[PDB]
Amino acid sequence: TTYADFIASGRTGRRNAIH
Amino acid sequence: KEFLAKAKEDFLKKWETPSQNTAQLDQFDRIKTLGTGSFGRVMLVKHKESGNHYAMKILDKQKVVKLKQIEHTLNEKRILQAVNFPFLVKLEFSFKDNSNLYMVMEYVAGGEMFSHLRRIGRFSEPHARFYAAQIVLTFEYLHSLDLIYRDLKPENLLIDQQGYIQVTDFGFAKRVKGRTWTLCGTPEYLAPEIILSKGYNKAVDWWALGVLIYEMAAGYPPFFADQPIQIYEKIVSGKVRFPSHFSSDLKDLLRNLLQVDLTKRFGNLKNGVNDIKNHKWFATTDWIAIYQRKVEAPFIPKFKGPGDTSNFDDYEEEEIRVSINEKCGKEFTEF
């Protein structure tokens, strides 16, 4: 499922900016 | 129509003559770190003479310079001290010392939207709509002042004691009448025209609202991957898939906010924000009642008293260091 793929991804925590 | 005229006059007065040096560090006791971001640390502090609690953002001048954020940091403070709106955090004091810049805000005790969203999983559509409506009104206000906000995401949205939103983090906000070009923001929330280096305007904020509504209602963003580069490829293709539980009205709104073609994106057409306010997904929204904070919020955070930090994650604490030598004095003269 898309949810399962998100939770297993590396970007479920607080996200920093790019600059 | 008339309210925004009056609002622009108070804003312009403060934009043209900003407040400066309205407190000093030794007026506060530092308690606990509430959050770190890409650039600064925000601590809970207690003001000694009043007993009030505040959130103090601390920026290390040398780090700001190293990350090439001088102008952005001056924008941040100049804009935040000039605005006034129910859903924007209030800046109470600002000052600087040899090493750091300080912005002291009202403390918003309910935590980041981010934490509640990840824990609960997703918000139901009426819950997401309640938050989305507050952002629509906030962007209407900001854009009427020629401001682009440029960093909407749950990490920069706080829930107050009544369950309403407070927008924080003006680090990328900019007053601009034409186009601007800086590559800045958070990958998941970047509009295609930013990635493509085309020049861009206030429409990027309406794209980001589309991303936020999707993430609130789905529990995950519309474009994600392990590496930003792969996120960018998905954004510029513009292909979006919707969860099975999204209402038809929500899908229609999102197709119009997550529109790659600027000339078709809601918020950027002849009717401006009214295309969004008049959309069927908002048909039950009483825009005036939201502005007046007369609607009962769907979620009210728990608080055991002033100074309670239980709605925030714990962070490693670091000492505030102040050099005996002034750093970057001329660069930050106007702060």
Ligand SMILES: Nc1ncnc2c1ncn2[C@@H]1O[C@H](COP(=O)(O)OP(=O)(O)O)[C@@H](O)[C@H]1O
């Ligand atoms: N007024 C506030 N009250 C409570 N917490 C806040 C406040 N402002 C910011 N924070 C917390 O501090 C974090 C970082 O602040 P922010 O201004 O976003 O810094 P950065 O520019 O480094 O991201 C936020 O994500 C939030 O957790």
Ligand SMILES: [Mg+2]
């Ligand atoms: Mg932030």
Ligand SMILES: [Mg+2]
């Ligand atoms: Mg920031």
